[PDB]
């Protein structure tokens, strides 16, 4: 009998489908199961790339979960996928970098949330912020001759009850950012041999979702 | 006096991306080591742990037309069952409607189910006529345009009818294959024997002719729905999945 | 104690004559007007015209609501004026008069924010409902507040928090002769509507 | 039942989604506003000097 | 036989000067690793874990003049809301006053509360006359000058009496805002839309004229204080806070 | 009625302030408070930096409360303006320094109690000591190729109750010095590479703080 | 499967001579690792810890 329904008619779109005989399909063998968020997006995913052409300079990126930007800079692959399934976010993330190349390089990485004075983004350039700027607002300072990796929790501080990804014009310059993470490279002094870094976000057990968005149409969805 | 000894193993230093407790943050520049409590109060109280939330929405996946031109036994449309099926596009912006349970299939390896499509006839009240949708389990390689209507019936169907205050048609496509998992092989690049996506094909015939009076248009076009249930998916990857045409 | 507030050295105590009297005799039967009565009542929003040279998928009526709900003419615009921020949810009507010698169908469906990219294949992820001429000609959806500050702002709104989208979800057609078009209303009325912050800056 | 008054065949159950919410930290801690805040408060009516 | 082993996970050797438990010393120079008591002895028994210490101590933010001259309606002095503003200055030496509840929040990004002003009048017993204090919500980038006397009486307001023996008055204006929290913007350079900082501006209006016998002085200037309650903040920085002057 | 109040009454200045009609305000999501003194000095700050010229030269810094030093030698930032709100403070130091550019570099630090004879401050020159005379004090001795920061705590010891921060003249000059951190390198052998060093000053747990003043007028705070 | 993980934290192989418990020997040449009990008897009952 459940094979017939108006569907026009929404409280009879949540009766339970049935067409043909059927059995139960037994269990699924394998213990986990993939298709809970906080296991796929579990592992981590790609974000961007950059590379240092000389010494004693700083480089800075938001973290910016608008449609609008275009990778290279911007989110690529998955994460720009994964963002736009949903219309809202809240909670901490868990960033990982990883560092390839020179060595005996020593390097201070902050983060900056949202609003406050910073470097402009996207952009390699000379640091403009007095030294005493930077260690107040927390940093971490690592040699890539030791580790050469680094997997920190961005904390969440925004005026923002929640940040958004699907977003235009006005509101999405302002909403649509996360924070800024920055990296300054320090003791660079022979331009050989490549320094260069890359990053991978994930998302944490304390972060939230909202309201299901739909998926985002081919043409959107772009890689680097 | 201090004796504490630990032997280094191997595999020192190597970051793992593979699963979540490999990709858990050390340390933090939250102060004070600060946590969060939850706030469902602008959400609306709804919290998504779960794909089932998308896939368990219809989606349009396809639209044919119903013509009263047709003669008994012709084919309207033949469709492959997998999530992976949209025909659909637009025109201002340039873009490929995609469907949800798609883009929820398309990031994974593998998959199993019941995909549950759910046809919606646009009649007047005033036009009869029938259908029969004819489930041919196989593979999707498999020639179909050579069966008949007679021949069709042995495979499991369901006829339906236009008029009436019931429009829609919810059909349960059993799982049928003899592997466990079907395979998403759009990856790659060309054809293999024995490995497959759809479980088999589907087919659309007409069963009666269309019949109306003059004042009214003289054919029916309906729309295909597409989700899924009791769905299984893993081993994730990242893929565009490009419209299926013909 | 409500909000202005004297704070006096010379005060006194004030001369009443009479009080409040009951009327035996109603002057008139409805019940006094208030908030739930003004705010919260069904408003006209967009009307248009619904025609076969329509394509598939082509957007009939795109609203902004809560932009729309806000202008001189509708008697909700006597608090909104007056406060400078909300948060509330929405009811939304939309209904069309097909003749059953016509055939197709539209949806309706509430998107936050903007429609940006996703897909339009997928409008029935948001909460939406189906016009078809061969079942009903009327739906009711009501979605609770999303935004991403604590409440709307409406001298300089950042982003339009609903904005609602309609498109023809199957081509219309007819026989010959047979009324070529139908008309379309929305109605929309707020929902649990909370105000704050008095100001006289809005004149 | 307020006072537009749909009369209608064809109805239908409206969908909801979700629900109201308490808000468990307050955007702003004044009362929210209805008529007995509006309407009754203290206005300014002439003002003029006496000589 | 002996075995103990452990994989060192990434981010070896790596500072964190994010928060304490990653600042506190693994060694120490004190001999015997030694232990320090508490001495409460010299101190008046007053310790401080709190910054709650001052910013619940009122402070000198501004004074402004109030002049017999001046007509029923116009607007003496207006002041946006938030723990930022100063506008005092010195001479000898050169140097630039600060409130307290200002030098707490210089230092950090976001800030929500009450901010309580206090106005202090010094009249005489035989000046008389009143002031209307004008709340007016929003952002700090508003323009307020437009606004007339019989217009202000909508938003809250609180009107005072000069004379008496009570010369000061509390004013709290209640926290309104459309996000949780305000930000501090004068580390960045330029303005934008929907980042603010303030919650909005406050008017001091002359709402009867000053009036006086000849034999005293015919202006009575008033203090403005400021000080918070319910204060919360987070993200520490460091800032150096301007005047801001008009 | 709490609208209006005496302020030249101190009795009356206690009472609670009531103006408008409100709500209690929720309460604050985050679990943590960032305005307890413990926690936000709970973060490190920036003290100083220096940089060795030639092989086997030792340098020597001690750490003045004093307001008066002005910088690069004195306290910068942050710390020069939290230790000007309150009049007192006693109880240990968490100190971290950080190594950076050349590597095989042996180095020992020691910790000076005030008054007792010690190199003069701020002043890069060749030990004066007996290298008898240093490791009695007590003294870590540290390699830069493995390690590169050290986290150690400075004692409390003195002679004073304690140590104050907002002193003139002949008392400025003797107690407010908390005491001297010395740093000898050897084995620098090579004169490029730029050795260079940074210090980070916390406070602990066992800190006290008494008697709080009023904040610095906004010349005085200054950076490097 | 194993799974045991330790961050290296900072101040790696840093010698700490200030108090006794950094100064305390992780190995011995001493045979087996053997303890030596107190002997008082040439001593005179003097023992001096102060």
Same mark, same amino acid.
């Given at each position: ?89 809240? *909670? ?14 020593? *390097? ?39 580790? *050469? ?21 006005? *509101? ?53 | ?246 | ?5 004297? $704070? ?51 957007? $009939? ?16 615009? =006597? ?24 055939? =197709? ?5 509430? $998107? ?5 990219? =996703? ?41 339009? $928090? ?34 704050? =912050? ?6």
């Amino acid at each position: 009998v459940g094979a017939i329904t108006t569907i026009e008619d929404p409280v009879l779109a949540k009766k339970v489908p049935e067409t043909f005989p059927e059995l139960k399909p037994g269990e699924s063998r394998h213990t986990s199961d993939h298709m809970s968020i906080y296991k796929f997006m579990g592992r981590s995913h790609f974000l961007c790339t950059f590379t240092f052409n000389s010494n004693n300079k700083e480089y800075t990126f938001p973290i910016t979960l608008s449609s609008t930007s275009n990778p290279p800079h911007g989110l690529p692959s998955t994460l720009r996928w994964f963002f736009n399934l949903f219309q809202l976010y809240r *909670g901490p993330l868990d960033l990982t970098i990883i560092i390839t190349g020179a060595t005996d390089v020593d *390097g201070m990485a902050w983060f900056t949330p949202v609003g406050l004075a910073v470097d402009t983004p996207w952009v390699e350039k000379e640091s403009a912020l007095q030294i005493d700027y930077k260690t107040a607002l927390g940093a971490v300072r690592f040699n890539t001759r030791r580790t *050469g990796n680094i997997q920190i929790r961005l904390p969440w501080y925004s005026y923002l009850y929640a940040v958004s990804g699907a977003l235009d014009g006005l *509101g999405d310059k302002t909403d649509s950012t996360f924070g800024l993470v920055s990296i300054q490279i320090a003791n660079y002094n022979h331009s050989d041999e490549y320094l260069s870094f890359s990053c991978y976000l994930s998302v944490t057990e304390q972060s939230e979702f909202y309201f299901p968005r739909a998926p985002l149409n081919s043409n959107a969805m772009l890689s680097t | 006096m201090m004796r504490n000894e630990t032997r280094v193993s191997t595999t020192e230093n190597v970051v793992n991306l593979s699963n979540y407790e490999d990709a858990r943050a050390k340390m933090s520049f939250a102060l004070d080591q600060e946590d969060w409590k939850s706030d469902p109060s602008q959400g609306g109280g709804i919290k998504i742990t779960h794909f089932t939330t998308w896939t368990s929405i219809p989606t349009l996946a396809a639209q044919f037309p119903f013509n009263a031109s047709d003669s008994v036994g012709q084919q309207i449309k033949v469709i492959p069952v997998d999530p992976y099926f949209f025909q659909m596009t637009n025109t201002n912006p340039d873009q490929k409607c995609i469907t949800a349970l798609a883009s929820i299939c398309q990031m994974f390896c593998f998959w199993r189910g019941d995909l549950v499509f759910d046809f919606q006839v646009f009649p007047t009240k005033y036009h009869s006529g029938r259908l029969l949708f004819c489930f041919v389990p196989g593979n999707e390689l498999i020639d179909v345009t050579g069966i008949t209507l007679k021949q069709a019936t042995t495979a499991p169907c369901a006829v339906m009818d236009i008029a009436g205050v019931q429009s829609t048609l919810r059909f349960r496509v059993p799982w049928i294959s003899d592997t466990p998992y079907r395979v998403n092989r759009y990856t790659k690049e060309a054809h293999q024997k024995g490995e497959y996506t759809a479980i088999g094909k589907l087919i659309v015939y007409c069963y009666n002719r269309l019949t109306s009076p003059s004042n009214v248009a003289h054919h029916v076009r309906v729309n295909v729905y597409l989700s899924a249930i009791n769905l299984e998916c893993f081993a994730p990857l990242y893929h565009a999945m490009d419209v299926t045409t013909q | 104690a409500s909000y202005f507030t004297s $704070v006096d050295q010379s005060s006194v105590h004030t001369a009443e004559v009479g009080s409040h009297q009951i009327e035996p005799l109603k002057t008139s039967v409805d019940k006094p007007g208030s908030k739930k009565t003004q705010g919260e009542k069904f408003f006209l929003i967009h009307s248009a015209r619904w025609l076969t040279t329509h394509a598939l998928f082509h957007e $009939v009526a795109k609203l902004d609501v809560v932009k729309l709900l806000y202008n001189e003419q509708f008697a909700v615009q =006597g608090l909104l004026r007056y406060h400078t921020y909300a948060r509330f949810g929405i009811e939304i009507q939309v209904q069309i008069n097909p003749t059953p010698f016509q055939q =197709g169908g539209l949806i309706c469906a509430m $998107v936050p924010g903007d429609q940006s990219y =996703g897909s339009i294949a997928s409008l029935t992820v948001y909460p939406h409902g189906l016009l078809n001429c061969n079942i009903n000609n009327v739906v009711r959806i009501k979605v609770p507040f999303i935004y991403t500050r604590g409440a709307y702002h409406f001298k300089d709104p950042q982003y339009p $928090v609903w904005e609602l989208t309609i498109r023809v979800w199957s081509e219309l057609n007819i026989g010959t002769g047979t009324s070529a078009y139908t008309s379309l209303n929305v109605l929309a009325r707020f929902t649990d509507l909370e105000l704050h =912050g008095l100001t006289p800056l809005s004149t």
